[PDB]
Amino acid sequence: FSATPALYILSPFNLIRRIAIKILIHSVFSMIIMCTILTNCVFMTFSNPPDWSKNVEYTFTGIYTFESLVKIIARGFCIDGFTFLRDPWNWLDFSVIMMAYITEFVNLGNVSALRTFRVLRALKTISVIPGLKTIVGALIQSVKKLSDVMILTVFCLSVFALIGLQLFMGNLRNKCVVWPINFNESYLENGTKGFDWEEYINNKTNFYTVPGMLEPLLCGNSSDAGQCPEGYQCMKAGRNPNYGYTSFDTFSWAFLALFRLMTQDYWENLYQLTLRAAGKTYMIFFVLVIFVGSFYLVNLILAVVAMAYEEQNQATLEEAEPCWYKFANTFLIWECHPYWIKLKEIVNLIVMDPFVDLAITICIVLNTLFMAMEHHPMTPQFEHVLAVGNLVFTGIFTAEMFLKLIAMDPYYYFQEGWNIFDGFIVSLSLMELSLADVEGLSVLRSFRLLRVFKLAKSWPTLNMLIKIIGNSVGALGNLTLVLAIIVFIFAVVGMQLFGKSYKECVCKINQDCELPRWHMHDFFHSFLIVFRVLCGEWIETMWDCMEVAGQAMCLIVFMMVMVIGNLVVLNLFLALLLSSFSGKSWWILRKTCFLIVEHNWFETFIIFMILLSSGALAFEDIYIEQRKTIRTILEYADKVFTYIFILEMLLKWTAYGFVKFFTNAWCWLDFLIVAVSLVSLIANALGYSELGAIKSLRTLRALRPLRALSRFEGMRVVVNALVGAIPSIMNVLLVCLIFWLIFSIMGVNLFAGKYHYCFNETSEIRFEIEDVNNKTECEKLMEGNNTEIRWKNVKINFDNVGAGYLALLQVATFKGWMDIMYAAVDSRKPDEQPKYEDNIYMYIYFVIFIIFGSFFTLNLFIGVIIDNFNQQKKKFGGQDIFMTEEQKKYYNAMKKLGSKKPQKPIPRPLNKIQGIVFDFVTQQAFDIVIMMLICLNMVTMMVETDTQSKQMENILYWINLVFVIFFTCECVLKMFALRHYYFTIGWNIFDFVVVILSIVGMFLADIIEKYFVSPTLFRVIRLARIGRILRLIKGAKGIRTLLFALMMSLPALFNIGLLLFLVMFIFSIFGMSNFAYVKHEAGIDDMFNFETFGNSMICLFQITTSAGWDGLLLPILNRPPDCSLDKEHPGSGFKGDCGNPSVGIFFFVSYIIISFLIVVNMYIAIILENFSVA
Amino acid sequence: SMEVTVPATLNVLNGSDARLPCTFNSCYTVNHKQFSLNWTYQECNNCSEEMFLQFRMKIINLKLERFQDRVEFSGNPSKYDVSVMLRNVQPEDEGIYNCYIMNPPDRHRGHGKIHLQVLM
Amino acid sequence: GCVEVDSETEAVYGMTFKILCISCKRRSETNAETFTEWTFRQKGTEEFVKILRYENEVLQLEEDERFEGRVVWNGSRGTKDLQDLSIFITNVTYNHSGDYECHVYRLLFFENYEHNTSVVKKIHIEVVDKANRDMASIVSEIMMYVLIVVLTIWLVAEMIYCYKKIAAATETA
Ligand SMILES: *[C@@H]1O[C@H](CO)[C@@H](O[C@@H]2O[C@H](CO)[C@@H](O[C@@H]3O[C@H](CO)[C@@H](O)[C@H](O)[C@@H]3O)[C@H](O)[C@H]2NC(C)=O)[C@H](O)[C@H]1NC(C)=O
Ligand SMILES: *[C@@H]1O[C@H](CO)[C@@H](O[C@@H]2O[C@H](CO)[C@@H](O[C@@H]3O[C@H](CO)[C@@H](O)[C@H](O)[C@@H]3O)[C@H](O)[C@H]2NC(C)=O)[C@H](O)[C@H]1NC(C)=O
Ligand SMILES: *[C@@H]1O[C@H](CO)[C@@H](O[C@@H]2O[C@H](CO)[C@@H](O[C@@H]3O[C@H](CO)[C@@H](O)[C@H](O)[C@@H]3O)[C@H](O)[C@H]2NC(C)=O)[C@H](O)[C@H]1NC(C)=O
Ligand SMILES: *[C@@H]1O[C@H](CO)[C@@H](O[C@@H]2O[C@H](CO)[C@@H](O[C@@H]3O[C@H](CO)[C@@H](O)[C@H](O)[C@@H]3O)[C@H](O)[C@H]2NC(C)=O)[C@H](O)[C@H]1NC(C)=O
Ligand SMILES: *[C@@H]1O[C@H](CO)[C@@H](O[C@@H]2O[C@H](CO)[C@@H](O[C@@H]3O[C@H](CO)[C@@H](O)[C@H](O)[C@@H]3O)[C@H](O)[C@H]2NC(C)=O)[C@H](O)[C@H]1NC(C)=O
Ligand SMILES: NC1=N[C@H]2O[C@@H]3[C@]4(O)O[C@@H]5[C@H]2[C@@]3(N1)[C@@H](O)[C@H](O4)[C@]5(O)CO
Ligand SMILES: *[C@@H]1O[C@H](CO)[C@@H](O)[C@H](O)[C@H]1NC(C)=O
Ligand SMILES: *[C@@H]1O[C@H](CO)[C@@H](O)[C@H](O)[C@H]1NC(C)=O
């Protein structure tokens, strides 16, 4: 232990130094420091420390001082080698102790900062608990590895932020301002009776503010943008929305908004606001930024972190290569009587090991399927059946426990971990019935669900799930402890920094002067906020804390939380995943038809036919009583489509044969579509053109594009891959359904029926629970009053395992879970009005669910998918499973052409002036100055802001003139140098197109005085300037390689994109048919609805990333009590205000699943390709 | 109450100037119309309290016989200063200054205490 | 709510016709108190004369004999926010031709801001006796038949050509 070559003052031979070393290494010192620091962390968790623990704080302080004294008397001063100043964490020790000695006396006035700086004490655990330093180190190498991807992410967000700034400059401010200026009564702010523009335009009660919403409505002058009501105009007027932080009006806020788009955090609101202000035609920009900045950049970050973690993991795995016995023998051994031993032998034989497992597992499955059947509205007979089945099942398990206990000695019985788990379960089961009148405590009955896990001995894959959960707290218990410590330190930093601010500035974020739902005042709520930031919803609370406690502090804190917490959660996820991983005319006619089928031109013709027939569905929307000529021509072309497809069916039959045709799935698909279309045809041709299931069969025409699945090769290959991978996914989905069934039954036991309201919707306030506690007095209020007071139910409730699965899929997708958790934590009793956060600790139920059934199940599912795709790749020699054969040739062409090319260096021409000009153009100095002026142009682009002074506009105009002149002069110099050989490299061609297009932009800026005044095309040709800053990637190497990886991986993305677009098309037609004419309630507005193909594809693309799909679903699930079953609906004979709930849930659940399986394969096609690069 | 900071104890010479402020820091930077500040003076701890200075949508001085034309408000509510200065201090002014403030948009209505004594 | 469709410009004598005018609010939430006037003039006649005024509860028609006892209202039923301005004529005569104009007057209600608006849509109808069924549908029927026939002819020509070619190929060996 000693090993002391120190040889310092206070000689190492001294008694005091030897005693200090002896006590220092001694493990009881480490244990008492553990106790001290854990109690310190708890007292930090304490919000307002009462003065009767101020001395306890001094006690802790003194313990730290004693430790510091010991470490100083054991090689203290920095001069000597191997001192404690060489070890970095002792810098933290000295810092925290010295700052405590600063704190307890007079100090600086920033009390909050000095109070916060105590978090180093909690950080000490990272230093002192064994093994954590290595975990932090590994995190450090992974971060060090992801540098190039950080650089490319920064420059890509910069480019896209400039695009968004130049396009949506100020558009977010567009508000419906009262236009018919009422001069005669336009008072001034100081009572002048005069009218000032800058006061009228910013007066907050001159805006619209759609009744019910908070922000004033965004509006727009474009043909497709939002629509001002009658008596308003669309001038930009006042502060931006979301307190002013959602804006493109400056490069800072544009960068914030596009970092928000990158992580897709609440990006559907930016989507809706910007499309409502600037017009729906700008959805192209959002598609471009979601398929580049969101999917691709996040995929690249995850792939690089995964590569680094795999490299480090493989490197670190490769580098390695009696006293109680005597009491037990008397009491744990139950052989004391000969007849007792005979009974033991008998019952051990009566176990029937081959026929005991089946009986017990059958009882477990029947028990879980009895616990599934639960409701709030329960008939007394049904609850009696549930109770008697509960008693029967618990009796069966008690019988098994006692039988095994008597059959095998309790020593060897408890010697099995499975048996100790069974004993825990049976004890928990028995303590229920005896305690049948305990107040509250409905959580206890939920522990019975763990019996299902006894099927782990049966399933290998449920064993894999248990293996993952064990490795979380087993081999990686130290890393999950690092995660817990970090989620603790951030939780307490937030509470010490913004905790008092959230209470001082309450009326700035919540209009009722109450604490917001998710604040940082207590410790529980601060932990909830940091957990939410780990889930992904940072922006919606960053706005609030910026509004209460300064922008800079929240920006720094929340960026730190995101980066560090997401790094640690990602590392934990990959740690778990890598732990898991390891005559003679019939024959001639047949062959002639075969030949006519196999003709390429004919296939192209049928492709065009299916495209036209499928696109003819788009025109069938609510704007169909207009353009009656279009409806008539398309209806009469529907007949010829049916004819040509029946003809194709018949001719394919003749060409192939009935057996050959009906043994193909695609041919069954085509036959089914043609048959249903023809059945509808004959039905409409006959008098039975309506009044039956024929109309409901009419909407099935949306399945017509499926023929493109058979025809188009890329979609066929992708669907082939997905279907082939389904069998390895069925078992994992069974595990996920069983485990989410456990969670859903527990949720039902906790919440069933505790999700009811009493709106007085005239005021639409959820009655505070002192006017109406019970449901019964809410009925009293009804019977006294009229329907203007109701007893609503949260629509995504937990009231049976079906609604449980729905609400729990919402909670697990992190969309729509906020209302569920609000109505849960407000829930108190089954027939009692909810009270605001009267059950706050039900939050931990959703925390547990997100940890287990959304994180661990996702980990299992992803691991199985990766294993399956590794297998499938290994089957066909490692080739890709998302490319056609010609796409494979394309792939190999880039694989060969991506190498190092010995390009011609353009030998010098035979002129001295040409010699010197090529010395100029070939010198590295000329390149680097070009890059620096590109950077200067980039900064002078980002400095352009809304509401900028006209002088600044002129200065920017002239500096842009200077820069474009410089670039054009360089271009023409290189042309005079060698035009013909400088038209050889594509980079130069990009330069020429950008310079000529910038010249076009500036000429048209000068000559906008013409007959073709177009501001929008003018902003686009301004965006054309941005292309020049893309030349910086030429001077980069890793960024160029990564862009090459994207280029090389495009074809698979293209095939999956065709499949995803075709799925969007089918579901959009289904929405146009069903979910048109639905109430515009929440997430379905006057725009972003299903009333047209454009709006429907808008909504489907929003849902493809799961964003706000609760919003779209919610107005569907309402009922004629909360609807109008016979609405006027002018301009169309269709009636009814809301659709069918059942098809609403099937439409969105099946899209979320289908889209999830599609977008996942997009990730894999990207992630695995990046691995194969190196 | 309200986050109001004041000089805990101030000493003033006979007949010399004395400025006793009530600085305060709150959310919702102070507006002028809906804002209100009050000033109460007590000639001693357990005796009567007397209103002498108001600001309800405008500066309103009650002009008591104790502070006829001596207490003047030259503070800055926007700069979070509602200070009162007492020129020609007289020993029967020894007592308690209490400033009452209400920041409109918050409801953290609070109080203020100042103890002033005059030296012989 | 927004399907703004013109009425039809043909009415057949003796049976019923549906005069159609739909003024659609630009934002549907707004709740407004709306009433209308219908102005009418015959073909080759002087300026328009009001015929029916529907104000939020009941249809008051002018005492002209050209429309008495034969005009009924088919707009939005009893909602005070019409948004659907449709006149129904029973037993169409030859008189009911010329020019119709639906005058709609809206009083949109806002937070603290009333607004009075007027929109006028012009619809011209002509009365026939035989229903001159339209040109688009007829040309679409001829298009249907000609396309069906031409595709069948293409198929037969291609299959006979292939049959002859491959019979000539198989007679070689
Ligand atoms: C934004 O515009 C609205 C609409 O004009 C302004 O509200 C108006 O404010 C003026 C003065 O604040 C009110 O006039 C006053 O009326 C009272 C009678 O109650 C009279 O005694 C006063 O002498 C004075 O004339 C006016 O009634 C009020 N109108 C409405 C509909 O509220 C509002 O002040 C503007 N916002 C800003 C910041 O200026
Ligand atoms: C509210 O503030 C505005 C501006 O801050 C005040 O407007 C000012 O009103 C005075 C009184 O009429 C103006 O003074 C005179 O204006 C006439 C205009 O022809 C000029 O010929 C005279 O020589 C004299 O300057 C003043 O111009 C006008 N504007 C400014 C900037 O002072 C308004 O009076 C204020 N209202 C109240 C109730 O105090
Ligand atoms: C939407 O369209 C309108 C016009 O089509 C855009 O311009 C707005 O036009 C009105 C006049 O029709 C302007 O009102 C006047 O503006 C001057 C400007 O100094 C003001 O001093 C006068 O008192 C008068 O109110 C209105 O200001 C103008 N809008 C703006 C922002 O200046 C409108 O900008 C378009 N909205 C967009 C593109 O977001
Ligand atoms: C649900 O909340 C709404 C909130 O508005 C309650 O409606 C309000 O009921 C009060 C009852 O007194 C109405 O007050 C009345 O106002 C009229 C007009 O000024 C006055 O003539 C009467 O003497 C009386 O003061 C108030 O107008 C009314 N507000 C609205 C917008 O209708 C309703 O009572 C609540 N229902 C339940 C069951 O709690
Ligand atoms: C929900 O329903 C329960 C019964 O199903 C209600 O309990 C009953 O509450 C009422 C009023 O809250 C009680 O009446 C009052 O009782 C007090 C003493 O408890 C007495 O001093 C008064 O003169 C009056 O009689 C009633 O006694 C009580 N039932 C029993 C058996 O004690 C409960 O109040 C309901 N929740 C509400 C109304 O929010
Ligand atoms: N990034 C977020 N995505 C969605 O999930 C959260 C929520 O559950 O659903 C919607 C979004 C949400 N934030 C919250 O703002 C709120 O609750 C909701 O917008 C309103 O419908
Ligand atoms: C204001 O009122 C006067 C009446 O004195 C009228 O002549 C004028 O047209 C009105 N102007 C406006 C803009 O209301
Ligand atoms: C609304 O405008 C119409 C148009 O002339 C007019 O007849 C009517 O009286 C006006 N009503 C109100 C309340 O302004």
mmCIF file of N, CA and C in Angstrom, chain A residues 501 503-508 512-514, chain B residues 3 25-29 105-108:
data_model
loop_
_atom_site.group_PDB
_atom_site.id
_atom_site.type_symbol
_atom_site.label_atom_id
_atom_site.label_comp_id
_atom_site.label_asym_id
_atom_site.label_seq_id
_atom_site.Cartn_x
_atom_site.Cartn_y
_atom_site.Cartn_z
ATOM 1 N N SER A 501 -36.658 31.720 -9.227
ATOM 2 C CA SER A 501 -37.164 32.517 -10.338
ATOM 3 C C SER A 501 -38.520 32.014 -10.809
ATOM 4 N N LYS A 503 -40.796 30.954 -9.158
ATOM 5 C CA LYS A 503 -41.815 31.411 -8.225
ATOM 6 C C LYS A 503 -41.948 32.923 -8.182
ATOM 7 N N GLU A 504 -40.874 33.657 -8.471
ATOM 8 C CA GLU A 504 -40.993 35.108 -8.554
ATOM 9 C C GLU A 504 -41.747 35.528 -9.811
ATOM 10 N N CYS A 505 -41.414 34.922 -10.955
ATOM 11 C CA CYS A 505 -41.962 35.301 -12.253
ATOM 12 C C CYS A 505 -43.128 34.417 -12.691
ATOM 13 N N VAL A 506 -44.006 34.003 -11.772
ATOM 14 C CA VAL A 506 -45.061 33.053 -12.129
ATOM 15 C C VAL A 506 -45.987 33.640 -13.187
ATOM 16 N N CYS A 507 -46.335 34.920 -13.054
ATOM 17 C CA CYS A 507 -47.318 35.510 -13.952
ATOM 18 C C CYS A 507 -46.757 35.811 -15.333
ATOM 19 N N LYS A 508 -45.471 35.545 -15.571
ATOM 20 C CA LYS A 508 -44.899 35.817 -16.883
ATOM 21 C C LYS A 508 -45.034 34.619 -17.813
ATOM 22 N N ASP A 512 -52.532 32.511 -15.179
ATOM 23 C CA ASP A 512 -53.301 32.462 -13.944
ATOM 24 C C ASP A 512 -52.449 32.736 -12.713
ATOM 25 N N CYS A 513 -51.184 33.115 -12.902
ATOM 26 C CA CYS A 513 -50.245 33.352 -11.805
ATOM 27 C C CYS A 513 -50.086 32.118 -10.923
ATOM 28 N N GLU A 514 -50.152 30.942 -11.537
ATOM 29 C CA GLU A 514 -49.839 29.680 -10.889
ATOM 30 C C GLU A 514 -48.562 29.115 -11.488
ATOM 31 N N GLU B 3 -39.449 41.618 -2.394
ATOM 32 C CA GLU B 3 -37.996 41.707 -2.324
ATOM 33 C C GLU B 3 -37.590 43.174 -2.343
ATOM 34 N N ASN B 25 -36.275 44.639 -6.238
ATOM 35 C CA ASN B 25 -36.100 43.938 -7.502
ATOM 36 C C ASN B 25 -37.229 42.933 -7.667
ATOM 37 N N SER B 26 -37.920 42.997 -8.798
ATOM 38 C CA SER B 26 -39.050 42.112 -9.055
ATOM 39 C C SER B 26 -39.010 41.682 -10.517
ATOM 40 N N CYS B 27 -39.884 40.746 -10.875
ATOM 41 C CA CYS B 27 -40.181 40.480 -12.270
ATOM 42 C C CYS B 27 -41.046 41.617 -12.812
ATOM 43 N N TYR B 28 -41.318 41.590 -14.119
ATOM 44 C CA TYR B 28 -42.262 42.530 -14.727
ATOM 45 C C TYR B 28 -41.839 43.982 -14.483
ATOM 46 N N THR B 29 -40.753 44.362 -15.164
ATOM 47 C CA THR B 29 -40.218 45.720 -15.094
ATOM 48 C C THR B 29 -41.337 46.753 -15.017
ATOM 49 N N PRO B 105 -48.316 43.339 -12.503
ATOM 50 C CA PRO B 105 -48.597 42.044 -13.050
ATOM 51 C C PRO B 105 -48.284 40.841 -12.158
ATOM 52 N N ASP B 106 -47.323 40.921 -11.238
ATOM 53 C CA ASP B 106 -47.195 39.932 -10.178
ATOM 54 C C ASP B 106 -48.196 40.260 -9.069
ATOM 55 N N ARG B 107 -48.401 39.325 -8.140
ATOM 56 C CA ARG B 107 -49.219 39.587 -6.961
ATOM 57 C C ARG B 107 -48.417 39.374 -5.683
ATOM 58 N N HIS B 108 -47.088 39.453 -5.779
ATOM 59 C CA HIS B 108 -46.204 39.321 -4.622
ATOM 60 C C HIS B 108 -46.209 40.649 -3.871
#
